[PDB]
Amino acid sequence: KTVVVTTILESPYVMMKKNHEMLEGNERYEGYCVDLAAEIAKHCGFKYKLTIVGDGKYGARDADTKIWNGMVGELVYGKADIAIAPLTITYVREEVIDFSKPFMSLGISIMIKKGTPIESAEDLSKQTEIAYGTTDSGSTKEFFRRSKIAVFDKMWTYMRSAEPSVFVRTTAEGVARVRKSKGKYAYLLESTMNEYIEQRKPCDTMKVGGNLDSKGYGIATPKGSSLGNAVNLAVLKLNEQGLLDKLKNKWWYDKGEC
Amino acid sequence: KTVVVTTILESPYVMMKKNHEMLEGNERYEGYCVDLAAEIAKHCGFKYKLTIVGDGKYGARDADTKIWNGMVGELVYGKADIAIAPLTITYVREEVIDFSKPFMSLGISIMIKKGTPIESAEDLSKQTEIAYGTTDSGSTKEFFRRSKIAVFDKMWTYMRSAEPSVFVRTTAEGVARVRKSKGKYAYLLESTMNEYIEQRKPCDTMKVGGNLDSKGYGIATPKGSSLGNAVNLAVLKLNEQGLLDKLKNKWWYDKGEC
Numbered sequence: 001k002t003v004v005v006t007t008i009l010e011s012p013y014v015m016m017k018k019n020h021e022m023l024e025g026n027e028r029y030e031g032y033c034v035d036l037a038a039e040i041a042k043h044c045g046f047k048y049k050l051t052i053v054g055d056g057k058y059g060a061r062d063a064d065t066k067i068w069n070g071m072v073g074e075l076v077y078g079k080a081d082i083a084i085a086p087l088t089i090t091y092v093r094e095e096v097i098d099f100s101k102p103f104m105s106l107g108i109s110i111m112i113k114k115g116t117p118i119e120s121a122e123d124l125s126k127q128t129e130i131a132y133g134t135t136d137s138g139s140t141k142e143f144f145r146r147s148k149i150a151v152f153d154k155m156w157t158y159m160r161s162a163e164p165s166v167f168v169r170t171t172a173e174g175v176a177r178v179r180k181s182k183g184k185y186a187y188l189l190e191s192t193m194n195e196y197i198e199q200r201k202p203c204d205t206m207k208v209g210g211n212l213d214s215k216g217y218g219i220a221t222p223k224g225s226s227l228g229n230a231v232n233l234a235v236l237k238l239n240e241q242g243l244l245d246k247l248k249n250k251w252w253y254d255k256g257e258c
Numbered sequence: 259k260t261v262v263v264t265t266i267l268e269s270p271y272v273m274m275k276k277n278h279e280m281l282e283g284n285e286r287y288e289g290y291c292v293d294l295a296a297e298i299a300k301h302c303g304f305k306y307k308l309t310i311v312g313d314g315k316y317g318a319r320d321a322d323t324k325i326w327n328g329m330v331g332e333l334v335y336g337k338a339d340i341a342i343a344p345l346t347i348t349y350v351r352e353e354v355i356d357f358s359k360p361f362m363s364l365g366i367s368i369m370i371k372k373g374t375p376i377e378s379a380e381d382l383s384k385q386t387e388i389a390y391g392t393t394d395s396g397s398t399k400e401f402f403r404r405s406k407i408a409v410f411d412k413m414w415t416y417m418r419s420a421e422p423s424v425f426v427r428t429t430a431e432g433v434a435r436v437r438k439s440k441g442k443y444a445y446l447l448e449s450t451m452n453e454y455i456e457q458r459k460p461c462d463t464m465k466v467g468g469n470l471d472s473k474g475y476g477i478a479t480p481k482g483s484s485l486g487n488a489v490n491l492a493v494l495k496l497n498e499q500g501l502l503d504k505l506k507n508k509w510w511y512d513k514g515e516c
């Protein structure tokens with residue numbers, strides 16, 4: 001049976017090919033995760049269908065309804081068999097779904113419009129002029145909401161009450177906000193995305209400071225899935241073979257426009 | 259049931275405390291992994307006994323004899339219940355034992371005596387004047403043996419046949435060799451150790467170039483062990499709580515000497 005792969009439209013992980021309107025199925029997409037999915041499928045010997053997550057979210061549990069959304073929800077409720085995307089491995093997610101060992105390492109970082117007088121999370125927490133926020137329904141927002149660390153707690157206290165909302169629905173929306181805010185908005189997103197955008201026209205944004213944490217992305221499967229073991233080994237193999245490093249260079253720097 | 263923890267004497271992960279000769283049990287040791295064992299045990303609710311791996315090795319499968327040695331062997335043959343040490347998550351190991359998500363991220367790096375005219379792996383491969391090797395029975399040696407990447411394969415071809423042997427039994431042995439070879443020997447070891455040593459007297463070593471790969475250390479358990487799940491969630495919890503970062507800052511920086 002064809003394996004249903006849930007993923008998210010997030011450059012450069014999954015993107016629409018130039019002539020996608022003339023293409024069908026998996027041929028409509030290109031990107032790091034499109035390439036990765038092919039490698040994993042070949043190694044695990046299965047056929048698959050890439051499907052873009054319906055609500056366009058990574059995945060969080062509704063504190064009220066206790067219902068999971070995004071890619072996590074699609075796995076939890078049986079809509080998809082596996083998730084291949086820049087989905088972060090976290091405690092609350094590991095409680096409901098399985099994750100392979102990481103295929104990419106990263107951490108939350110700060111994106112600023114070049115020239116913005118900010119160099120750290122501490123800087124952001126101390127000032128009021130420059131607003132800052134994160135993407136909704138993901139591990140980054142949960143990071144600040146749950147942090148007991150002084151700096152991050154202060155930032156969360158501010159973000160949770162900010163008006164207008166400093167939270168964005170997608171990475172693209174956040175990038176646009178940084179670029180159009182004349183330096184009055186800083187965006188908290190993972191290092192992977194930050195460094196990617198840093199290499200794309202108009203080259204007006206940049207990553208400042210070190211990462212706030214260290215974590216990774218994992219391929220996810222519903223709890224008890226029979227695909228789990230083989231996928232985990234496939235990831236480890238592809239990494240040791242240097243394929244993952246090649247894919248990173250391919251989509252991040254070989255095509256860099258800055 | 260007292261959980262038997264197999265680990266290895268490797269500074270600053272596990273070290274004999276001053277006057278350990280008059281100490282007993284777990285109290286004889288100190289270090290990053292000693293602290294981690296305590297937190298993991300507390301979260302998983304178990305008592306444990308730290309034991310230093312008999313052959314002082316990380317773990318590899320002997321060709322021909324096909325028997326696993328080091329900490330991996332301890333787990334595989336039932337000598338230990340869990341391994342808490344700087345043990346790299348690898349494909350071949352994952353085939354015989356289980357690993358938690360990583361508690362530390364790192365990569366293979368190059369250590370040189372300060373002043374050595376080498377800045378990359380390519381440099382080492384492009385010459386023969388400066389010898390170079392890795393530690394025996396571990397992920398680093400296996401990395402070169404299996405790599406199909408031009409530079410690394412060329413390096414392996416040289417190392418496999420070099421005389422006298424460029425392979426060392428322990429990192430301390432590799433470090434001492436770099437320090438006493440007047441720049442005629444470079445050492446291939448993980449970034450964690452390289453960075454640690456660079457801040458220690460006689461402050462005569464340094465890391466050059468970026469890491470060759472990206473991987474992590476995981477807490478290992480016998481395949482199918484009941485401890486697997488709880489340990490994995492414990493590692494994720496501790497990382498998200500910021501404890502893993504505090505622990506590294508404590509054993510690498512707070513104590514740093516150069």
Ligand SMILES: Cc1onc(O)c1C[C@H](N)C(=O)O
Pocket residue numbers: 010058059086087088135137138139140141171188189190193
């Ligand atoms: C990608 C990405 O970049 N910044 C982020 O917060 C994310 C989403 C994050 N990886 C998640 O799984 O929620």
Ligand SMILES: Cc1onc(O)c1C[C@H](N)C(=O)O
Pocket residue numbers: 268316317344345346393395396397398399429446447448451
């Ligand atoms: C620690 C350490 O530092 N360099 C290395 O090769 C190692 C050993 C490596 N972590 C293993 O598991 O074999």
